Amino acid sequence: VHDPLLAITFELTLRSCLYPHIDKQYLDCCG
């Protein structure tokens, strides 16, 4: 998933766009 995310500041704020994907899944799991 993060390999196509690089196309659409590198590995600092860009890497902080990867983390919402594990956050959204985590919310569904715990709820």
Binding site: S16, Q25, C29, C30
Partner: peptide, 26 residues
């Protein structure tokens, strides 16, 4: 023995893994 790279999302890592296993136990 550890890095701090994964720190800003680590809580939601651990708290998802263990809770998913507690789903799997049902």
């Amino acid at each position: 023995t550890m890095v701090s790279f994964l720190k800003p999302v680590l809580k939601q890592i651990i708290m998802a893994g263990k809770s998913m296993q507690l789903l799997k136990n049902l």
